[PDB]
């Protein structure tokens, strides 16, 4: 009986924790090197909110809408891209090794039990986004009612 | 058109609610051979009881037990949580309830034309019902994993999800038009 | 003995339930993104995420392409991020399971055309369907244009 | 002694020929369903030359700049994306199977001799592009003299 | 016995010569794209493919992350296409060889931080380098601004 | 790409070349070179309907392709049987050459009724459909054969006929765009 | 995110909390819970400098960590020796502590001579550098450990110190832009 | 300054040409253990000769045989073509020729200021030189494949490629600047 979060098996928990830490650090450094200097004020669409979005899209290998234009921002983006490529390839290779070793011991297709955790996370994220949007809409509607 | 949009929304909501109510209540969810009145005989199982088919004791239905404690095994708490979630059918029932409340909101939208938030609430309920149907399908399949075929009752819930999501799109589109119309009138 | 590969044997690495749930999750994600992008009039549209555009965005995200747009709201970005994580896990699982199936034979050579004939058939069918839809739209518009005059 | 073009080993020659044929057909169909309608004129930058670019970028999983907006064009793009994903995953999986089976045969790292063919193809493409650009430059330079 | 993985053991699947040639081919492709994009005055710029932007485009193409720009000329598109094919082959080879290394042990567990510590070190070093460059730019502009006034 | 008279002539000659190549491909028994029996195993050249002997004891004795062999054929599934029927009947190459002939007739008929601009669009649609049909036929035949071999010139005659059909169809729709552009251009003036 | 006085107080309290957490983590020998000796095999809680016994026959006895053990250590290459030296000295946790202290000193002295706007930028640089140093220290410590085991509260004390430092550093740079915006606002008028 | 950039590009072209000519000339390309003047001894080999190192027969260089016909084997024609390409060192030498042509074009630019098309020619020559250098490196490594370490001579060729590509980039800058200045002058 595979675990619910059995899709995190190829990498260790320490790797995931360090991945989250590295993502946070890269996002903060990108925001800093994007908007700290008054002499660049901005001309770049890289705030703290947009920096985290760019880093997430880079890790998921889905370039969303923007790319850094300054030298430091591009350095951050390049090192993050290299890290992401290595980590994703490592995950895929280790999962393939796990599956091949399980297949070669003395049904065959992947079952929904092996990826049920990713579905749970996806639906939880959909619900969280719905709740956030509803709260924002309620706050904006209340603000308009008070003003009017 | 506004009237045609309302008609389509109501028809789709009623169809989705009926399909989910039939799917949850009916027992043609899975075609699997199994024992009876607890020999090997082909049966069809739903969410509560499995009815033995084409056998010597055909017709009789045995209540499905989601906690096979014959060996008194616990393993990890994740398995117990999944078994408890699947046994109650909390997610298909929640989807049916959300569909029913969305239909109520759609019906009550006609009485109060000024209050546009009822249409948005109906759309939100329809989308949440679809998501609950998705979670129920995932949980049901995972519990079944922990030859076989899926009957028409299972596909009734699958078709209800597609219809419920389609109606949710229609409702929010109707909410979008209502606010744009209000803004257009204020422009003049 | 090894049997002749099926036409639609490219779906073998993932179970049928996984593909069905993938289609359903795609539909749900598209609907939720369209809902959270355009329901609030206070965001009006500033974004370009209609139902058609949301479906296109989710399809592009699943195939790891991305079309031309990205959510800008917090809720839309949460939806996009969870969908991206889902897509990454699912595609990696598919590739890993196909590698495992090709490495170990149960009861290595280059993949033959019989291994991907199903995907080729689906591609040609999609091309034909697109041509039919475009021709239908052109015929519908041509008669409508003549009706006006 | 591995072949120069041994990176095509995981797939068959029939698959490569059919991939080229499918690319041509999809590009032609995209151009057809993009610009044949006089009532869409255009609002889309999908010509015959641009359709080939979009299809090539889609096959290598590198969306370049644009995406179809018409329903038929989006159908073409979706089926091409599904085909591309399946084919690329099949290539990666068969290459992994080849390497794993070779490893369990009774140095380890991939040598440059395995990818020498892709390096040669890349440099040949660079040279061809440079030659084409020089030809275009000379043609425009001659054309301006004729006008004057 | 299985030795403790090296700090930079994540480069093991591809040989050192392959990595060196990858870096050099990236440089060459960037230069060729910049040349074919901006050399002709008849193209003047209409495109945004400077040397820095061409380097960014090639780096994004190799990591399969995309870019905000794309070549529009025939020669630039040929360069982009051959670079994309090269990138696809190289990344697929890296993933396949890493899978082979993780499947067969010569003389399976979850990957540990020791296996990927080097990529983390490189990431943090790049972050520090970026901070240093940004601080240097700010200091240079602060002194230059004071010189004007 | 330029003018209209040369474009019409180039498209017409391309359509004629594609039609001739596809007709030759359908009617020539040189599609695959493989070992087999043309009546022991020996090198033979095969086609769509018959396979003749090659460099054997009795060279040139052609025998019809065993599409439905007897003596415990082991049967197959519905999809495999459908594929076998498609390969035997050669429905897709025949449909391709039919579409090519229809498009050529439309192009020849385009000289008359020049006001009817939809004829050239119909010819382009026919040629694109013929190219897709050629793709399907090539894939089906290769899959059927795949279960040391090489293909003959007629197989590459059909392969080039698909490319010529699409290249002709590409610039045939260019005329439909330009013909509509002419009406738009003359409307403003 | 709003106003200036509340932002200043929030940044100061966050910096102080991060400094306290990281200092406690450095000075507390509860980093890893694993079996081992503290003087047979028994459960022990480890830290950066000493490891004490847990539920053993002689509890409350700490022993210095064998960073360079004798008795045929077998040696290693330069990289492993460098990692061992870094882990033994725990320079990166100490470097993070020092950088956090400098950032706190700068942000506290920012009240005096408020005209100097570059002090807050220096505080932000100090805090982000301390966060990066914490990242390197955590990575080094985990890699040394991996060369059952669970991490102690002090290790997670330093895990939150890095998170707080970056979130404090984010706000530290944010108020730097706001101050320049005020200068830009008053320059136009 | 444009003159400063021209001086920089001339210095870079000279440095790259010197590095590449030394790399082709000297024989410290690869350190490996091999036979001497047909026992195992560590030797160094370039493109033409292998010379013994710290051995009894140290100092004598033996010409490399690129055609191992000891057993009279041919196998495929691709191997023979690769061996022939490596044997002549056609790509490193033709890269040397391309760098020489680029340097000549740069030097002759001061004679004709009006003719801007030859600075672009110099940039084209430098870029083609770098491409040919990378092809030569790939061919050399592939042929060597079918313990070892690369020497400074090999790294001089790698360093020459980087400078030539760097000089080619800045050489094209002049051609862009020459046309930009010319167009600006013609505007007024």
UniProtKB/Swiss-Prot annotation, chains C, E:
Which tissues is it found in, per the record? Detected in forebrain. Detected in dendrites of neuronal cells. Expressed in the pyramidal cell layers of CA1 and CA3 and in the granule cell layer of the dentate gyrus.
List every range the entry marks intramembrane.
Answer: 49-64, 65-67
What does the UniProt entry say about where the protein is found? Cell membrane; Postsynaptic cell membrane; Postsynaptic density membrane
The recorded induction information for this protein reads: Down-regulated in the pyramidal cell layer of CA1 in the hippocampus by global ischemia.
Q: Which residues cross the membrane?
A: 16-36, 74-94, 116-136
Q: Which domain of life is it from?
A: Eukaryota
Q: How is it modified after translation?
A: Palmitoylated. Depalmitoylated upon L-glutamate stimulation. Cys-67 palmitoylation leads to Golgi retention and decreased cell surface expression. In contrast, Cys-139 palmitoylation does not affect cell surface expression but regulates stimulation-dependent endocytosis.
- The record places the lipid (S-palmitoyl cysteine) at 67, 139
Topology feature Cytoplasmic, residues: 68-73
Q: Tell me how this protein assembles.
A: Homotetramer or heterotetramer of pore-forming glutamate receptor subunits. Tetramers may be formed by the dimerization of dimers. May interact with MPP4. Forms a ternary complex with GRIP1 and CSPG4. Interacts with ATAD1 in an ATP-dependent manner. ATAD1-catalyzed ATP hydrolysis disrupts binding to ATAD1 and to GRIP1 and leads to AMPAR complex disassembly. Interacts with GRIP2. Interacts with GRIP1. Interacts with NSF via its C-terminus. Interacts with CACNG2, PICK1 and GRIP2. Interacts with GRIA1 and SYNDIG1. Part of a complex containing GRIA2, NSF and NAPA and/or NAPB.
Q: What function does this protein fulfil?
A: Ionotropic glutamate receptor that functions as a ligand-gated cation channel, gated by L-glutamate and glutamatergic agonists such as alpha-amino-3-hydroxy-5-methyl-4-isoxazolepropionic acid (AMPA), quisqualic acid, and kainic acid. L-glutamate acts as an excitatory neurotransmitter at many synapses in the central nervous system and plays an important role in fast excitatory synaptic transmission.
Q: Tell me the protein family, please.
A: Belongs to the glutamate-gated ion channel (TC 1.A.10.1) family. GRIA2 subfamily.
Q: What else is known?
A: The postsynaptic actions of L-glutamate are mediated by a variety of receptors that are named according to their selective agonists. This receptor binds AMPA (quisqualate) > L-glutamate > kainate.
Notes concerning its domains? The M4 transmembrane segment mediates tetramerization and is required for cell surface expression.
- Give the protein name, as stated in the record: Glutamate receptor 2
Q: What is the originating organism of this protein?
A: Rattus norvegicus (Rat)
Specify the taxonomic lineage: Eukaryota, Metazoa, Chordata, Craniata, Vertebrata
Q: Which residues of the full protein are shown?
A: 529 to 846 of 883
UniProtKB/Swiss-Prot annotation, chains F, G:
- List the Gene Ontology MF annotations in alphabetical order: ionotropic glutamate receptor binding; voltage-gated calcium channel activity
For whether the record's keyword set contains Transmembrane helix, the answer is yes
> Where does the protein principally reside?
membrane
Tissue expr:
Brain.
Q: Which GO terms describe its biological process?
A: eye blink reflex; membrane depolarization; membrane hyperpolarization; nervous system process; neuromuscular junction development; neurotransmitter receptor localization to postsynaptic specialization membrane; positive regulation of protein localization to basolateral plasma membrane; postsynaptic neurotransmitter receptor diffusion trapping
Give the stretches traversing the membrane.
8-28, 89-109, 119-139, 157-177
Record key words, sorted: Calcium, Calcium channel, Calcium transport, Glycoprotein, Ion channel, Ion transport, Membrane, Phosphoprotein, Synapse, Synaptosome, Transmembrane, Transmembrane helix, Transport, Voltage-gated channel
Task: Look up keyword Lyase and say if it applies.
Answer: no
What subcellular locations does the record give? Membrane; Synapse, Synaptosome
User: Topology relative to the membrane, per the entry?
Assistant: Multi-pass membrane protein
Q: How does it assemble?
A: The L-type calcium channel is composed of five subunits: alpha-1, alpha-2/delta, beta and gamma. Interacts with the PDZ domains of DLG4/PSD-95 and DLG1/SAP97. May interact with GOPC. Acts as an auxiliary subunit for AMPA-selective glutamate receptors (AMPARs). Found in a complex with GRIA1, GRIA2, GRIA3, GRIA4, CNIH2, CNIH3, CACNG3, CACNG4, CACNG5, CACNG7 and CACNG8. Interacts with GRIA1 and GRIA2. Interacts with MPP2.
Q: Which disease is it linked to?
A: Defects in Cacng2 cause the stargazer (stg) phenotype. Stg mice have spike-wave seizures characteristic of absence epilepsy, with accompanying defects in the cerebellum and inner ear.
What's its job?
Answer: Regulates the trafficking and gating properties of AMPA-selective glutamate receptors (AMPARs). Promotes their targeting to the cell membrane and synapses and modulates their gating properties by slowing their rates of activation, deactivation and desensitization. Does not show subunit-specific AMPA receptor regulation and regulates all AMPAR subunits. Thought to stabilize the calcium channel in an inactivated (closed) state.
Similarity field = Belongs to the PMP-22/EMP/MP20 family. CACNG subfamily.
This protein's name: Voltage-dependent calcium channel gamma-2 subunit
Q: Per the UniProt entry, what species is this protein from, by scientific name?
A: Mus musculus (Mouse)
Taxon lineage: Eukaryota, Metazoa, Chordata, Craniata, Vertebrata
Task: State the covered range within the intact protein.
Answer: 3 to 214 of 323
